[PDB]
């Protein structure tokens, strides 16, 4: 975890983009190459698409996810089984 007294992390290029994209409403999936942001409560109910290493993977974000960071719904290396 972070130190608390610095506050949570989020990029500016996703914070300003998400405050624009709430107030323009469109569920065209917002893509991002920034998989290290703490998801904020006013990001509840959005379809973003985080990079995983190859392409974006879409993530529809609910109330339950808002503690975590955007990486933990993009599993990185593929695995099927030997």
């Amino acid at each position: 975890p972070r130190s608390l007294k610095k506050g949570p992390f989020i990029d500016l290029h996703l914070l300003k983009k998400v405050e624009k994209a709430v107030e323009s409403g469109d569920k065209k999936p917002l893509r991002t190459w920034s998989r290290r942001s703490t998801i904020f409560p006013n990001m509840i109910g959005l379809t973003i698409a985080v990079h995983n290493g190859r392409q974006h993977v879409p993530v529809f974000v609910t109330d339950e996810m808002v503690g975590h960071k955007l990486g933990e719904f993009a599993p990185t290396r593929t695995y099927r089984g030997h």
Binding site: L4, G7, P8, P41, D63, E64, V66, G67
Partner: protein
Amino acid sequence: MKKDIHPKYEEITASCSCGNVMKIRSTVGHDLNLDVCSKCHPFFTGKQRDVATGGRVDRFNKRFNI
């Protein structure tokens, strides 16, 4: 009821620590207490306690703000 082959049956006190004095016949012999009394038991006042879900907005805005 056959007269012999069934065991003993005598009245014994079964009090609880919350104050439910009672008498019941059994074969236990000794005075037997009680821990849990269903006249104040946590089933009608104490099974809310587990749910512990919480809004994630609440776990967010309990520790800091913006």
